């Protein structure tokens, strides 16, 4: 039984009091592709009608 | 001309060697 | 003659032996070492014997 604070002191000397982790419990059921910035393009350089049997259009405009 | 032939002439095939004296002398004279 | 048959450099042998000591042994070489303790083939067995002798003392 090497006390209880001796183990903590050894861990702090060796590891350095940066162990604990922060994570979120409610995760998403399905992973989707995240939305990212979609920039716009910025280029560098640039009456009654009928069809007649002879292939033309005839329009009666009253 | 072998490297020895060119060197003996005062200044070309690197694969050929010199083993005959008459041919070496003839080539040296030809270079000169 | 050509350089390709000159000799083995000190650095070259050093590198080869260091890689030999680091990489380990292939399974058939482990089998050969086990057999020995209990032209290609001659060279391989001589290499194994050299490894054994170097592992013993030096």
């Amino acid at each position: 039984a090497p006390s209880a604070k001796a183990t903590a002191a050894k861990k702090a000397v060796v590891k350095g009091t940066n162990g604990k982790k922060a994570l979120k419990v409610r995760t998403s059921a399905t992973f989707r592709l995240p939305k990212t910035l979609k920039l716009a393009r910025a280029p560098k350089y640039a009456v009654n009608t009928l069809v007649r049997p002879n292939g033309t259009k005839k329009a009666y405009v009253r | 001309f072998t490297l020895a032939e060119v060197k003996a002439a005062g200044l070309v095939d690197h694969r050929r060697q010199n083993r005959n004296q008459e041919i070496f002398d003839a080539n040296v004279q030809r270079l000169k | 003659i050509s350089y390709k048959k000159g000799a083995a450099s000190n650095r070259t042998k050093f590198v080869r032996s260091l890689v030999r000591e680091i990489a380990g042994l292939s399974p058939y070489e482990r089998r050969l070492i086990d057999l020995i303790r209990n032209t290609r083939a001659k060279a391989k067995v001589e290499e194994m014997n050299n490894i054994i002798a170097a592992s013993r003392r030096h």
Binding site: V14, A29, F31 | - | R11, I22, G24
Partner: protein, 199 residues
């Protein structure tokens, strides 16, 4: 159902490799890279190595332009910096010029650095496996650097480098030289240790 859709394939493979890293029985040459410097020794090593950080492109250009402007109108000591680059440091080690060599432990083609601890020990060059290849690049002004080295040091820091070498010899070399040559990675999980070690 099919809940696997909560992880993309790359995340799943990325974690499967992590599991395989600790479950597989790794050979000693690859196992030695899990033994790195502790917090204090690593923090003290990067205090010396951060004082010899090479000049960036902008600083070097400014220094050269000042000299050029001085010349255009009308005897220096040798510089000191940390040596990097794999081939350069390897050439330094086998010439016995490096005083201390830091080797990163997370080189993705691990075979690029597997021979380095052995070469450093064989050639009598102090070495240390330092956790983080991105941290060695900060003192090099690169994103990553596989290795770093100290060949020459300013006379003010000569004692500090010797003390650091002795500290690494006591903390890293003499401490791990027996377990360095043992196969690692035989960690047993709870569901497996419960049924094998107990039974």
């Amino acid at each position: 159902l099919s809940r696997y859709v909560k992880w993309p394939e790359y995340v799943r493979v990325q974690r499967q490799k992590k599991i395989l890293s600790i479950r597989l029985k790794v050979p000693p040459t690859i196992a030695q890279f899990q033994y790195t410097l502790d917090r204090n020794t690593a923090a003290e090593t990067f205090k010396l190595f951060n004082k010899y950080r090479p000049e960036t492109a902008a600083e070097k250009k400014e220094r050269l332009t000042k000299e050029a402007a001085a010349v255009a109108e009308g005897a220096s000591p040798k510089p000191y910096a940390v040596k990097y680059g794999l081939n350069h440091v390897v050439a330094l080690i086998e010439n016995k010029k490096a005083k201390l060599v830091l080797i990163a432990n997370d080189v993705d083609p691990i075979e690029l650095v597997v021979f380095l601890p052995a070469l450093c020990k064989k050639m009598g060059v102090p070495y240390a496996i330092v956790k983080g290849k991105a941290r060695l690049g900060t003192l090099v002004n690169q994103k990553t650097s596989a290795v770093a080295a100290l060949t020459e040091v300013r006379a003010e820091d000569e004692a500090a480098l010797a003390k650091l070498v002795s500290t690494i010899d006591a903390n890293f070399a003499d401490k791990y030289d027996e377990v360095k040559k043992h196969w690692g990675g035989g960690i047993l999980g709870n569901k497996a240790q419960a049924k094998m070690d107990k039974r």
